[PDB]
Swiss-Prot record, chain A:
<protein>
    <recommendedName>
        <fullName>ATP synthase peripheral stalk subunit b, mitochondrial</fullName>
    </recommendedName>
</protein>
<comment type="similarity">
    <text>Belongs to the eukaryotic ATPase B chain family.</text>
</comment>
<feature type="modified residue" description="N6-acetyllysine">
    <location>
        <position position="6"/>
    </location>
</feature>
<comment type="function">
    <text>Subunit b, of the mitochondrial membrane ATP synthase complex (F(1)F(0) ATP synthase or Complex V) that produces ATP from ADP in the presence of a proton gradient across the membrane which is generated by electron transport complexes of the respiratory chain. ATP synthase complex consist of a soluble F(1) head domain - the catalytic core - and a membrane F(1) domain - the membrane proton channel. These two domains are linked by a central stalk rotating inside the F(1) region and a stationary peripheral stalk.</text>
</comment>
<feature type="modified residue" description="N6-acetyllysine">
    <location>
        <position position="21"/>
    </location>
</feature>
<feature type="modified residue" description="N6-acetyllysine">
    <location>
        <position position="29"/>
    </location>
</feature>
<comment type="subunit">
    <text>Component of the ATP synthase complex composed at least of ATP5F1A/subunit alpha, ATP5F1B/subunit beta, ATP5MC1/subunit c (homooctomer), MT-ATP6/subunit a, MT-ATP8/subunit 8, ATP5ME/subunit e, ATP5MF/subunit f, ATP5MG/subunit g, ATP5MK/subunit k, ATP5MJ/subunit j, ATP5F1C/subunit gamma, ATP5F1D/subunit delta, ATP5F1E/subunit epsilon, ATP5PF/subunit F6, ATP5PB/subunit b, ATP5PD/subunit d, ATP5PO/subunit OSCP.</text>
</comment>
Curated annotation (Swiss-Prot), chain B:
<feature type="modified residue" description="N6-succinyllysine; alternate">
    <location>
        <position position="75"/>
    </location>
</feature>
<dbReference type="GO" id="GO:0046933">
    <property type="term" value="F:proton-transporting ATP synthase activity, rotational mechanism"/>
</dbReference>
<feature type="modified residue" description="N6-acetyllysine; alternate">
    <location>
        <position position="82"/>
    </location>
</feature>
<feature type="modified residue" description="N6-succinyllysine; alternate">
    <location>
        <position position="82"/>
    </location>
</feature>
<dbReference type="GO" id="GO:0005743">
    <property type="term" value="C:mitochondrial inner membrane"/>
</dbReference>
<keyword id="KW-0813">Transport</keyword>
<dbReference type="GO" id="GO:0042776">
    <property type="term" value="P:proton motive force-driven mitochondrial ATP synthesis"/>
</dbReference>
<feature type="modified residue" description="N6-acetyllysine; alternate">
    <location>
        <position position="92"/>
    </location>
</feature>
<keyword id="KW-0375">Hydrogen ion transport</keyword>
Length: 58, 121
């Protein structure tokens, strides 16, 4: 008797967990990614304004 | 342009898996972080000229004044950049997150957790 009950109890929550983790992951990593892709571009930018002021002033 | 910053959240950042853009993130972190600190370095601007003096002992002071007026007038364009397609190279592997596993996962989570109750009985 007891065997099959524990087999079901494992499988049901398992499925919850793994999907809820799969959802949560992709949301977070991309919304994070969204902003990382900024940050990359734009860093370049501030550098060149910084640099210009030195460069001309020299 | 100048510096920008969005949602730099490094742990999930690399994590992506659109594979030809997956690999990029792992490096793009370090390229970025190096970047971030390297900007965090510089001065922005340098001095403002003591023009009153440079006339004094550049007594070719037409040159001084020419360059003085030019410097007083001289206002740089800003830089070039081009990867504001990354904004949208995001939205694609911005729907991947959405569609693929937004919806998949809600769907899947529904049947499973629901699937807890009935077989909990």
């Amino acid at each position: 008797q007891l065997e099959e009950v524990k087999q079901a109890s494992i499988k049901q929550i398992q499925d919850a967990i793994d999907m809820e983790k799969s959802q949560q992951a992709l949301v977070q990593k991309r919304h994070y990614l969204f902003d990382v892709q900024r940050n990359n571009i734009a860093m370049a930018l501030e550098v060149t304004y910084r640099e210009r002021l030195h460069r001309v002033y020299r | 342009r100048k510096l920008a910053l969005k949602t730099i959240d490094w742990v999930a950042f690399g994590e992506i898996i659109p594979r030809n853009q997956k690999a990029v993130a792992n490096s793009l972190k370090s390229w970025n972080e190096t970047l971030t600190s390297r900007l965090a370095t510089l001065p922005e601007k340098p001095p403002a000229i003591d023009w009153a003096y440079y006339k004094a002992n550049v007594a070719k002071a037409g040159l001084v004044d020419d360059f003085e007026k030019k410097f007083n007038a001289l206002k740089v364009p800003i830089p070039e950049d081009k990867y504001t397609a990354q904004v949208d190279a995001e939205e694609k592997e911005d729907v991947k997150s959405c569609a693929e596993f937004l919806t998949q996962s809600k769907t899947r989570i529904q049947e499973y957790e629901k699937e807890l109750e009935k077989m909990r009985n």
